[PDB]
C-alpha cells in the first residue's frame, strides 16, 4: 500500500494503516468519541493541539480553525496522510464543500467516507470534471 485517494475505512483501519505506513493521521479533537478510542490505546500520550508523534504520527486539531488554515498546516509539513474529510461534519460541512475545501491540500493523503458508495461520489468532486 502506497497510493492515495478516497476509501471507506473505519478508525481501526486508518490507525492500523498509519502505524504500518508511518504516515501522518490528523484527528478533530472535538470528536471526543474518536479521542476516547485513541486515548484508550495510546494512553501515555497527553492529548496536545498539533503534532503528537507517539506510536502513530498524530495531528490533533481544533474544529474552530478554518478548514483552510488547518489544511495549510498539513501542507507546510508536506507529509502523506490518512483521515476522513477535514471540513466535513467536523466543520458542519457537506461532502461536496468538504471535497472542494480539501482540494486546497497540497500533501498526498487518503480520505475516507461513511460508506463505499460515498467514495465514488466524493472522488467525483476531487476530479471536478
DSSP string, 79-102: --EE-S-SSSGGGT--HHHHHHHH
Q: What are phi and psi of 51, to 5 degrees?
A: -60, 125
Which residues constitute the domain of residue 110?
A: 5-129
Domain count, the chain: 1
Strands 56-61 and 109-110: unpaired
Q: What is the CA radius of gyration of the chain?
A: 14
CATH number of the domain to which 92 belongs = 3.40.220.20
Written as nine digits, the cell of 92 is 458542519
Cα 76–Cα 81–Cα 85 angle in degrees, nearest 5: 100
Number of other CB atoms surrounding residue 109 within 10 Å: 21
Torsional sign, CA 88, 93, 95, 101: negative
What does the alpha-carbon distance between residue 102 and residue 85 come to, in Å, rounded to a whole number? 7
| 92 C-beta neighbours (distance < 10 Å), count | 9
Q: What angle do CA 95, 97, 101 make, to 5 degrees?
A: 115
The 3-state DSSP class for residue 13 equals: helix
d(CA 84, CA 75): 16
Helices and strands counted in the chain (H then E): 5, 5
Helix axes 11-21, 32-41, angle to 10 degrees: 50
Instruction: Answer whether 108's CB lies under 8 Å from 79's CB.
Output: no
38-49 burial code (b ≥16 CB/10 A, e <16):
beeeeeebeeee
Nearest to 90 by CA among 62, 71, 117, 69: 62
| Elucidation technique | NMR
Amino acid at each position: 500500500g502506497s497510493h492515495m485517494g478516497t476509501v471507506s475505512w473505519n478508525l481501526r483501519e486508518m490507525l492500523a494503516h498509519a502505524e504500518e505506513t508511518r504516515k501522518l493521521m490528523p484527528i478533530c479533537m472535538d470528536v471526543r468519541a474518536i479521542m476516547a478510542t485513541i486515548q484508550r490505546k495510546y494512553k501515555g500520550i497527553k492529548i496536545q493541539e498539533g503534532i503528537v508523534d507517539y506510536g502513530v504520527r498524530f495531528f490533533f486539531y481544533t474544529s474552530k480553525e478554518p478548514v483552510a488554515s488547518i489544511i495549510t498546516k498539513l501542507n507546510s509539513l508536506n507529509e502523506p496522510l490518512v483521515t476522513m474529510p477535514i471540513g466535513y461534519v467536523t466543520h458542519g460541512f457537506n461532502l461536496e464543500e468538504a471535497a472542494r475545501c480539501m482540494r486546497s491540500l497540497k500533501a498526498p493523503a487518503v480520505v475516507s467516507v461513511s460508506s463505499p458508495d460515498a467514495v465514488t461520489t466524493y472522488n467525483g468532486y476531487l476530479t471536478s470534471s
